[PDB]
Amino acid sequence: EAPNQALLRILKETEFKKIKVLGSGAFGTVYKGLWIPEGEKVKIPVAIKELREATSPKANKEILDEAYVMASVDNPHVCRLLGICLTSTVQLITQLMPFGCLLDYVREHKDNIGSQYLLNWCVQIAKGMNYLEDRRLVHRDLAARNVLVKTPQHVKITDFGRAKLLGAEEVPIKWMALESILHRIYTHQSDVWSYGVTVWELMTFGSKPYDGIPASEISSILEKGERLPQPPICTIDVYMIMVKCWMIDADSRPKFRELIIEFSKMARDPQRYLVIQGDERMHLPEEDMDDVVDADEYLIPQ
Ligand SMILES: CC(C)n1c(Nc2ccccc2)nc2cnc(Nc3ccc(N4CCN(C)CC4)cc3)nc21
Ligand SMILES: [Cl-]
């Protein structure tokens, strides 16, 4: 096992300003903000995630594990941590994704969303996921809600709070592989099953999974051999791939690098694998912004 030499960057609260609340849930809230690095003359659009005024020690121990992971990843399809702030309670700063999470995005734009885009996201997510596998990381919470849109073309994975290294002792039931539900067993392959669900979410345009069914129920349903329905826009090819992600024997399930390859192919003839009405028709998208630099553009030594 190699040494992790990721640099953890420490930021002063003076370096950045919160502007809106992007989302508020549970313990903590995420802000849209601007970060200007010290003496750099660049402004970077950022999200800032912080917990409640309650500063309880256990919660911090959870946010710092997350930061740790996000600090340790470098892929175009994975969200990375810019740095952290220690001023009262910990905050995580990372690059902002303007269009929000993918799940919201498909629901909002279904009528302008096309086969090429859906296939591309699939390729992209599988890429981010393959990277994590390379780094031996199990996301353990992959959902459409945890994919973020920089742009319609570009998406990245996020929410590494539940992330573990593979083979480590250390709840979203619906996205969970059966082995995980029965035995709390997680492997990259468990991760793969979740990918299949995420894909199902996009093809059904944000439809809820096993809607109307209680989670306690779900283990039984899966046990019986039940699985998610084939989406209307889905060819048998595409659905066939999803179904492979949901096999009892996890070694029979596809590898993320296979998934990249198969969806990659489909993306060269997108109309053959996804049937959507008016597919051809569809197209998709504070005073001084001169100095605005995206995080992807902004780079540091190392
Ligand atoms: C809001 C959460 C999902 N988030 C975290 N979370 C996060 C997790 C760990 C560390 C740092 C951030 N990083 C984020 C980075 N970027 C964005 N962007 C973004 C998020 C939400 C929205 N909207 C606008 C449309 N609304 C209908 C729904 C809310 C627009 C843009 N969100 C992030
Ligand atoms: Cl759930």
Residue numbers in the entry: 697 to 866, 876 to 990, 1004 to 1020
Original paper wording:
The epidermal growth factor receptor (EGFR) is an important therapeutic target for non-small-cell lung cancers (NSCLCs). Unfortunately, in most of the cases, NSCLCs with EGFR activating mutations eventually develop resistance to these drugs, and in at least half of the relapsed cases the resistance is caused by a single secondary mutation in EGFR that leads to Thr to Met substitution at residue 790 (T790M), the gate-keeper residue. In the presented work here, we studied the binding mode of the SKLB compounds to EGFR kinase by solving their complex crystal structures. Through analysis of a panel of EGFR+SKLB complex crystal structures we identified L718, V726 and L844 as the key residues to directly interact with the N-9 substituents of SKLBs, which explained why these substituents significantly affect the inhibition potency/binding affinity of SKLBs to EGFR.
